[PDB]
Design a protein around this ligand. Sequence first.
Ligand SMILES: [Mn+2]
Lengths: 240, 255, 244
Amino acid sequence: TLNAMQEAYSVFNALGELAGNKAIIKGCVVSGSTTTDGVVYINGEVFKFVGGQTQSRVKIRYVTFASGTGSISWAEFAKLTTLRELSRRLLPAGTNPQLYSGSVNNIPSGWQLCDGTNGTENLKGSFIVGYDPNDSDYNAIGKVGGTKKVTPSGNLDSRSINVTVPRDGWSTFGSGLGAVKSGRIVVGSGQQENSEYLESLRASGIDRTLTSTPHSHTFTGNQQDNRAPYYTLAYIIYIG
Amino acid sequence: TLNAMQEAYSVFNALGELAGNKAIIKGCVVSGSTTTDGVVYINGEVFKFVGGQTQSRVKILETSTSKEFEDVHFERYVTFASGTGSISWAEFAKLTTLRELSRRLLPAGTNPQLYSGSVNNIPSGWQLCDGTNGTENLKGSFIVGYDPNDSDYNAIGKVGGTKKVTPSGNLDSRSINVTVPRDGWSTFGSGLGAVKSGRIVVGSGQQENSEYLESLRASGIDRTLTSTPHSHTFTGNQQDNRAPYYTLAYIIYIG
Amino acid sequence: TLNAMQEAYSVFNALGELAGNKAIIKGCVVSGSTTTDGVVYINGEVFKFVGGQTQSRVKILEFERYVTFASGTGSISWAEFAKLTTLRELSRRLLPAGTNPQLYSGSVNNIPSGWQLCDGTNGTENLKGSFIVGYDPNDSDYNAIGKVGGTKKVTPSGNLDSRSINVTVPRDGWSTFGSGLGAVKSGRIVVGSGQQENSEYLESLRASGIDRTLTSTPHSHTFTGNQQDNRAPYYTLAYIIYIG
Ligand SMILES: [Mn+2]
């Protein structure tokens, strides 16, 4: 019965495959130039690892340091994170959206788009912003805002122009008076008045630099893209 | 003492629970119409798996250790089979190794995560990326990808941007033209007489039977003038610089 | 041999390190007021766990025999024992290599083994300098993975309407130059002196009656905007991805 009571326990070597080929199951920690004792798994077999002075290469009953044949690079052996630690690093289902660049038509089993269905956040078309308990814009999960496009707007101040109306250069029409069209400006002829002196008239004295009534203009802005350089990725989440 | 021995090693079957029920522990690799031999875990027992032609169901068989019956001790194993006690083979899962899971695990404190759960019930070992305990303070921020070749983004933690912005700009300078007419000034009062000092004198349209006034003429032309240039100052209204956003918490695993 | 064989199966205790110290391997579930039996791993040894009424502490009893609820010197807080997620469940929560970019705040010069920056090399997305936006099957801007757009800066643009300017030419305020006529420069506007004509009566003349409000041809101005920063408050993190 000892044959049946050896083959029965021998199947436990295969449990090393849960760690993976060339995994360090236990121990094998570096001190200085020495690696501590431990347990390794190689090609379907669980081995006690007898340490001592490090030799960057190992060989195989137990595993110890070597070089030559059948030398295995000790760099190929990996230390593991425990299932306890992996479980602690696992966030509750439905709370941890993930970035996804794979096929949107082949979302992995148990996963879905964060689209508002099945209790998910609807993250479609959104830029994420960090929750901030002290900012009213971001002090709760799911607070939204922002716009894809914006149109600039603004005002112009009111301004006047100046124009100088000259007292000179109006030219002349017709002859001495005589008559002048009613409401038509009268000018000098350049000639002295004959036999008479006109005290009621004078040459104009100055040009007139006039200021216009103020005016402004309406500004009509063109729509612009409010988005910083973006890259589309899907937000997916594990449901179960 | 062999009772204590069996009871001792039998506890190792419980290690299959690390994989979970109906796990493929080792082997059982598909090769066309074939599945290789391997090791499986079902209902608290670790079993050798005997492969062959892939079938939809498997079962625990108990057969004689003597594999020939020419002219009795049993062994238990799992194989492709059918009927009472058989299990759908599709319920058996191949696993990712702990070595591979460890390689996919980023160091503590280096991997911020999106979180939509309760901010008052952040899981054990995790905290908000708030600047405490050596974390990045990601509160109120939009993340931008590190770029070693862009001075805006060439270090972790480089910040910039503004929630609000005010557009600004300039206007060019323009002149206008205006035509001053020699006609249409109308009239006020009567013959001279007197006219207000510095007030434009115009024709009355009347002709007296008098000595001609040689010192005067009707004006000859209208006057087209160009103004001095002018511009305007633009005062922009503040605008929201943010694209459509959604608030999520950035959390990180510390330990 | 009841020794070199007992030594042979004892090595399997080290497989409990895959779960980790104080792991609940199997069972030990709250079933009302009681905790079920199971298997636990403590200090390099796999032990059978004997249950009962949920106690706060446990002990190794006869060390190398079993674990059960017991308090006092030698006891271990039961709360230090952790239930585990199976490898089957961890495998289901594992996304395919190359499909899952991750935020990274560690050293950019020491990116972990098997990981790389999402920089466009080795079939990766080039996420350098980008703000991520969620895929949306209903929005043509975001209806395929990797659609891009947006700009770091923007320059506002716009137009001004056309307006005409008015100016009023006054009939008064031209002042005077020189004396009575006499003579006035040819083509120079004649104004009143404010004095009565002495001997003559000038019926051919009158004071002007009105000021003249004139309108210009319409004008506009060209607006030239200043460049502005299009980014909302940002924080630089690296996007990395697991390749293999
Ligand atoms: Mn203007």
